Amino acid sequence: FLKVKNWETDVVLTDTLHLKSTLETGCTEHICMGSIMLPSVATKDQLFPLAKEFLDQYYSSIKRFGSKAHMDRLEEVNKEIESTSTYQLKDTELIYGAKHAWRNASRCVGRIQWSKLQVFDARDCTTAHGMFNYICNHVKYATNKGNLRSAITIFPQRTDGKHDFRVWNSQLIRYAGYKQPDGSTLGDPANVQFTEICIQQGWKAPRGRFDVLPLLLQANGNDPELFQIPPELVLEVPIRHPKFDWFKDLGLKWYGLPAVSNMLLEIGGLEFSACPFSGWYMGTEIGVRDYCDNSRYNILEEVAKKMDLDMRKTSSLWKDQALVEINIAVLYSFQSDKVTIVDHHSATESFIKHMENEYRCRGGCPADWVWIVPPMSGSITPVFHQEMLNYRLTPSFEYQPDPWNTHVW
Numbered sequence: 001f002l003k004v005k006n007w008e009t010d011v012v013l014t015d016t017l018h019l020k021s022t023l024e025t026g027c028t029e030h031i032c033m034g035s036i037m038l039p040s041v042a043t044k045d046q047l048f049p050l051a052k053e054f055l056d057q058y059y060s061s062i063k064r065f066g067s068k069a070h071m072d073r074l075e076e077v078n079k080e081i082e083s084t085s086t087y088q089l090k091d092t093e094l095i096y097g098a099k100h101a102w103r104n105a106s107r108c109v110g111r112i113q114w115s116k117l118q119v120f121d122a123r124d125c126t127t128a129h130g131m132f133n134y135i136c137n138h139v140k141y142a143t144n145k146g147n148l149r150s151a152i153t154i155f156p157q158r159t160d161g162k163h164d165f166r167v168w169n170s171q172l173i174r175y176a177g178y179k180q181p182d183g184s185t186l187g188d189p190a191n192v193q194f195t196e197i198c199i200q201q202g203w204k205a206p207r208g209r210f211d212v213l214p215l216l217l218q219a220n221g222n223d224p225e226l227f228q229i230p231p232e233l234v235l236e237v238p239i240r241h242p243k244f245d246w247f248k249d250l251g252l253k254w255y256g257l258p259a260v261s262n263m264l265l266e267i268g269g270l271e272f273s274a275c276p277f278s279g280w281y282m283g284t285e286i287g288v289r290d291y292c293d294n295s296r297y298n299i300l301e302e303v304a305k306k307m308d309l310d311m312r313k314t315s316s317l318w319k320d321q322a323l324v325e326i327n328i329a330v331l332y333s334f335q336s337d338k339v340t341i342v343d344h345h346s347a348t349e350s351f352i353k354h355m356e357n358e359y360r361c362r363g364g365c366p367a368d369w370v371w372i373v374p375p376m377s378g379s380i381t382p383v384f385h386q387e388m389l390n391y392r393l394t395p396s397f398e399y400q401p402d403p404w405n406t407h408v409w
């Protein structure tokens with residue numbers, strides 16, 4: 001029953017939820033892995049404990065723990081794991097599972113919204129064309145004319161392992177990356193291997209900067225197939241600044257919809273290898289990481305120039321200065337277009353408030369400080385001063401290998 005303190009407000013919360021934690025962290029009594037980025041076929045023996053554990057908490061959630069329906073659904077799933085060495089979630093259990101996978105995502109600062117999640121059941125999907133259609137409806141719904149809405153589309157669960165449904169894209173909407181004949185990079189350098197894979201599968205690249213990549217969709221473990229998201233469904237925000245009119249000349253833009261498509265959704269021991277989920281952006285994801293990472297668009301160089309800054313001396317903080325302007329611009333541009341976005345101040349404040357709610361009516365809130373604290377201005381946001389216990393609850397979103405390494409073509 002551990003205590004977590006906030007050192008800006010002196011507020012203490014007692015965490016008991018970590019007792020329900022099952023998985024492991026990577027840390028031991030003698031080493032802390034809290035800054036390691038990635039911390040690391042299922043049988044029927046292992047499957048019923050996970051099913052039972054999940055069904056227990058689901059039925060405890062609808063205020064019917066131990067009722068007759070709980071007992072029968074338990075025996076129903078036990079018997080289905082006998083006959084088929086797997087089982088199928090009810091629609092309701094799927095929606096519960098998915099919302100709590102988000103709820104339990106310790107690295108997500110946006111979880112105050114976790115109960116407002118739109119779950120699209122795509123478990124009847126059979127082909128990549130079907131996936132494409134399901135993803136298009138996801139994009140359109142989640143974008144909602146810029147009034148973004150949280151959503152997840154859940155494709156058939158893994159069965160044997162060689163019939164996985166996979167979205168090969170790391171996110172549904174990402175810009176292309178092209179290495180250049182002079183060794184530099186165009187577009188997004190993070191996607192240069194993926195952009196070449198699309199080209200190997202036949203993508204005709206408009207070798208420019210902000211080229212929306214096509215979907216690479218693998219259905220039932222079959223080879224994956226290319227589809228272009230109808231561009232009218234890809235909402236983009238041209239980035240302008242409220243003071244610097246030359247900022248439009250940068251010609252920057254970003255897409256409104258952050259939609260992670262490479263993670264694995266675990267519910268009651270069932271594994272959903274394709275489960276694209278989307279919300280809305282926190283400003284810093286674009287302004288700081290996408291734009292100013294050295295291995296991403298890396299625009300601190302150009303933006304500092306146009307600001308009339310001292311780029312000779314490291315200690316002039318020209319980088320810090322141009323980083324703020326960039327993030328004022330990302331926010332202003334999204335807001336002026338009525339496209340949902342949250343600033344790292346409002347997002348972190350809501351997460352503290354979210355944390356307070358979880359400690360009250362749930363006994364805790366697993367949280368990964370290394371990821372919750374924004375990548376600029378860390379200590380002028382309240383999460384910097386908030387001790388956080390990280391632990392792995394299930395249902396959960398898990399990392400999984402990139403499919404081009406595991407697939408058998």
Ligand code: HEM
Pocket residue numbers: 098101102105107108109110111113117150151152277278279280281282285342347371397
């Ligand atoms: C609703 C608005 C949301 C906001 C503002 C938000 C914010 C964020 C941010 C800033 C990150 C860190 C991303 C990065 O640094 O790369 C993150 C990570 C994450 N988000 Fe949220 N998110 C939202 C919605 C969602 C939804 C709907 C889901 C799932 C149903 C989700 C699940 C996750 C997960 C699992 C991670 C961790 C990814 C990883 O470990 O690589 N989020 N979120």
Ligand SMILES: CNCCc1cc(F)c(F)c(-c2cc(C)cc(N)n2)c1
Pocket residue numbers: 110171258259260262263277278279280281282285
């Ligand atoms: C494989 N791990 C990916 C981590 C990641 C990368 C990324 F580029 C994102 F945009 C989001 C992300 C996701 C959601 C749902 C909301 C939000 N604000 N960000 C998360």
Ligand SMILES: C[C@H](O)[C@H](O)[C@H]1CNc2nc(N)[nH]c(=O)c2N1
Pocket residue numbers: 034035036037370371372
């Ligand atoms: C080394 C470190 O774990 C790695 O750079 C992490 C740090 N914290 C992060 N935090 C968020 N939100 N997103 C990230 O990609 C990372 N990267």
Ligand SMILES: [Zn+2]
Pocket residue numbers: 027031032033034
């Ligand atoms: Zn640790």
